[PDB]
Amino acid sequence: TFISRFAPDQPRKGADILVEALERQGVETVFAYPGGASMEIHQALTRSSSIRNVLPRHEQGGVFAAEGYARSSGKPGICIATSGPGATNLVSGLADALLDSVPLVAITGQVPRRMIGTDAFQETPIVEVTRSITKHNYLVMDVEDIPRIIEEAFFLATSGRPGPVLVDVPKDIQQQLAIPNWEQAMRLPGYMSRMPKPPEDSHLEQIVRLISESKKPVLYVGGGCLNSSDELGRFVELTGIPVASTLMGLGSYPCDDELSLHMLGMHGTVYANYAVEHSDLLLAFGVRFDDRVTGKLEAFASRAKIVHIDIDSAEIGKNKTPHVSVCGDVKLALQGMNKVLENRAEELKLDFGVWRNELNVQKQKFPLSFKTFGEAIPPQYAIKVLDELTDGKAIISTGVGQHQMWAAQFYNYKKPRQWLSSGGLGAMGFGLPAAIGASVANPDAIVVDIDGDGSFIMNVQELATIRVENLPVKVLLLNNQHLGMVMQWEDRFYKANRAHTFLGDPAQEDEIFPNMLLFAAACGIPAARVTKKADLREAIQTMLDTPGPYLLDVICPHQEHVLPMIPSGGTFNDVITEGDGR
Amino acid sequence: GLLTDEDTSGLRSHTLSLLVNDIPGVLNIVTGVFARRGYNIQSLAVGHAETKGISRITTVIPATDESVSKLVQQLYKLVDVHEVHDLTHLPFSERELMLIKIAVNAAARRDVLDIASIFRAKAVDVSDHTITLQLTGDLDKMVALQRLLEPYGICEVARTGRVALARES
Amino acid sequence: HTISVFVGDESGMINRIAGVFARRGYNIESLAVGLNRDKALFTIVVCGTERVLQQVIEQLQKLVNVLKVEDISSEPQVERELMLVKVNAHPESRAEIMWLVDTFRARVVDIAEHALTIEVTGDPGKMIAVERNLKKFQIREIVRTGKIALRREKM
Amino acid sequence: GLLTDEDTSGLRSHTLSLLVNDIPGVLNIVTGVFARRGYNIQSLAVGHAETKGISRITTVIPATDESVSKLVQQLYKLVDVHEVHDLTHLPFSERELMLIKIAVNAAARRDVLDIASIFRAKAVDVSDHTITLQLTGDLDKMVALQRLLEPYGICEVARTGRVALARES
Amino acid sequence: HTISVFVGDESGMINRIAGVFARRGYNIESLAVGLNRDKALFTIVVCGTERVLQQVIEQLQKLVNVLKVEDISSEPQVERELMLVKVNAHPESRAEIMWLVDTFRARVVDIAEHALTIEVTGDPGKMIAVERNLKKFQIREIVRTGKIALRREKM
Ligand SMILES: Cc1cc2nc3c(=O)[nH]c(=O)nc-3n(C[C@H](O)[C@H](O)[C@H](O)COP(=O)(O)OP(=O)(O)OC[C@H]3O[C@@H](n4cnc5c(N)ncnc54)[C@H](O)[C@@H]3O)c2cc1C
């Protein structure tokens, strides 16, 4: 039973129909940059207290907060932008949630429907701009079918590969007064034809008929186990396969058990690449098999037999050819995998100690070491410092780049969605606004954050959102005055130059740029600035007890580079062995 | 530069019979996928299917069936697509009208309509400035007429693109 | 309210075109296009007023690849629309589709015992006949090309 | 030397409708008899009969019916022959297609298709180099067209040989 | 996988030809030939791979009388195959073979009260239609010539 804010037969502004239809899905936090054209929905918000406006400081910060609330809860996050230019700034985060497969909903105003696309004022035909980068768009032309498409949006947000749905409403639609006809069905006829049915064990038979055939398995898990809390851990409790977790799957397998292969691929852990490029059956639970993990299409575990479980039918065979393939919701089909294979628990193989012996001799022979050149803090140490101090579970946001994988390869994750990424979009500036939404998905819980020196700056505006919303974000700044990802891509691609990698001021290159203390002190937030390891455990000690938010500022050494890095279309033969910036 | 060019097929040339809703922008959501999958669309012809309220797009894509399997399920990722049918590995009707205006004189108009009588082209409109044929059938009969009407004073060949249904026979 | 578009050297020529009816919010009634290596002649009918038709004949020329847009509506056209209807070929009811494809004067390309396929061609007035008159027999799957127009040229 | 010659009949010219199995070499067992009985085979056209699994050969042999009675029972000495029918002393349909490519110019192509319109010859393929008729009917209409297309630039007359069934009328 | 053969002055020209598919063990799918006093144009489709097709286009030139063998398969051909079907002409079921010979557009040469004879001509796709579509009426005796091909010649 929905607690209706008003009468069920009140002909009112469509934003009232809209904002009730959000709470009728059961959502509680929006991100609503205010409306010179989406005006009524912020007005209809203010007559509600079940929904919360975390009003961002930028709409790209807003949609990344709508990312950050989505992929730190699993509830489909809702941004609201103003029409036109506000909606153009979603196009960042909508391109995140499609590539990162994140259930997002983007409500946005449009202009009057008598003025749509007329080269009008405050207009961007964003229903047609973001056609290529969302799961669905909407351009509703009546009040009576506003919650038709809204429940269809949250259908399309939850169902299939969970994508973003930009849902647009014209300004004169909410300024048109009509009655909410609530319970009408999903006008969604084609999507039910591939609304993915539960794949039964007869389809999973040729997985488990090949589990015993598998001598060298690997558990190539990723963003499809984003709902698998312990179901993947139950699966490895049943059969014991060494994992290979990607970035949206970092957390899914709690990466501190015996098969602790953190991240695989071209930038992963080199001993998980050894785990994946030596298998005879590449078992995959929810991965998109991209270029910067596979390297080559045909040589990425060429000696394996790919099985690949996805909710998305189109993903199956998209980047990588599968040997035998089965669709279906993984966490549902894992409950139809582990809770059915107990009849075969005395029948199945479990003979992977000779495969667990391969990783053990190559765990330490292929290590996760660093170079403490003097005392300039290895950030790869500083995240092993993090889980030494963050008391275990920590919901962590990241920007992207060299500092992205430093959280990946060097934090011991304990739960999916207690981790944020942009691996698909690879969005710089995603980090700190992802800490905004994570601090309302899991508000009281530890929302620690890390950001690079530019990606912190690239969305530094949403620092002001924190003090307004009292969020306890714990943001680290892995500063190196440098575009930290592509400076290694100078070296290992072509040349050891410094071609526009230097982010800092060349007049004060030895000094900090910019002064992130006086960033947080500008928005009144407490801050720090770290370069030495003695204060490193001290600063996080000051961080996790700080009331409300906290910033700090480690200094990454500007010439420190990460294994591995292959050119696109590569194998583990083409690994780099020790690449630095010196 | 007057006439549309010769033929709309290569070697690969897969045909996909889309079946989408009658959304006002539903073409742009569908060829939006052909663009965003890096496919040239060699020919396309949309129209309203048997259930009035949905559409039907018949496309021609130069892609091998490995890449088409990266499209038929990828076109399923669209919301409005009810079904796609890779007709190219099936026997299928391939009929396409082709309105060919040809500028002719009086005596040459005799030596055009006979060719139009060969192809069962109903010469839909004639003047003294010109005659406009309208032939229909497979694309080989389309390209045969245009290969044979290039000797004559052709004008705007307003074609329509390959339209298909897989025959049961 | 119909438009013929001639476009030049690009790929995804339709995406420029079918965008700028959707992003302009002006609905296409139908469309078809004979694409080639560099040339394509669209034929687009847009169910709008002549005022908004005057916009989109020039707003489609805000696109770059368009060599020519001509609103062909005012001319005496030849609107010819093909419709490869696949009809249920049950011989209890096939027996009258015989003349009811002879009336519309269309070939029948492929026949099965329960599915025959006809090739109705021409005036959309005659096409909406078949979409209604042959709807009285159970239709498997109508596929139809878009309405194509040309100038009935005299001087 | 391009065209096939004029006609496939003499005075005697018996026709035998064979009815043989669909053995892969079953033609060579049948014309093996026409050779080993010293018969020239004036025309022959094989094909699959009404029961899919058997064939049907329609032959033309210049032999009088005394010598044909030394063949119809002699063809019965073959194993695969189910029946032979001496159709020549019966009324029988005698239809034979005849694909006649003719090299023509533009104006002469007018003065060919009209002749093809006389014989109800569907001009199956046309170019500017040539036109290829396809007429069908009795062999007299076959030889009449080839006697009338020898004035034109004929090309490979890909005939098919007399095909027969004895009419019940 | 089809072959056109032009042969010279001998008798029993077919015996050289129909031998060297049997004695080579490579099955003919169909055959027909317009023999004359010295000339004959075979048209042989051999259901084999293009490798073994490459053999028999030259192994038939191991015969002496063959003036020319051309594998016509790669060309755009005109495969036209006649099929003088004699159909049971019962007027309860004759009444629909009327249009079902008009669809395939064939003359009907001789009619009796229980046996009519049609003359279906052309594409083997259209011929296997009649062999299936008119199989739904009781067929007395199909006789068919072999598929005949020619070059759709352009330069
Ligand atoms: C510069 C850079 C370098 C990188 N290097 C690497 C690397 O070396 N190795 C590596 O592994 N990653 C790397 N990444 C990250 C990588 O780009 C993404 O993590 C990966 O492409 C997407 O994650 P995923 O495929 O595992 O899951 P996602 O793509 O995020 O989603 C899982 C996939 O399976 C299916 N799925 C989605 N939802 C569900 C569901 N609810 N149930 C079942 N199935 C579902 C979907 O089809 C989806 O495609 C890098 C990223 C960047 C930006």
Ligand SMILES: Cc1ncc(C[n+]2csc(CCOP(=O)(O)OP(=O)(O)O)c2C)c(N)n1
């Ligand atoms: C706007 C944008 N530009 C460029 C990139 C590609 N890119 C990702 S990270 C990166 C450099 C990394 O800098 P930063 O994100 O601040 O973290 P760092 O590794 O320097 O600590 C680049 C060039 C991107 N994802 N987004």
Ligand SMILES: [Mg+2]
């Ligand atoms: Mg940085």
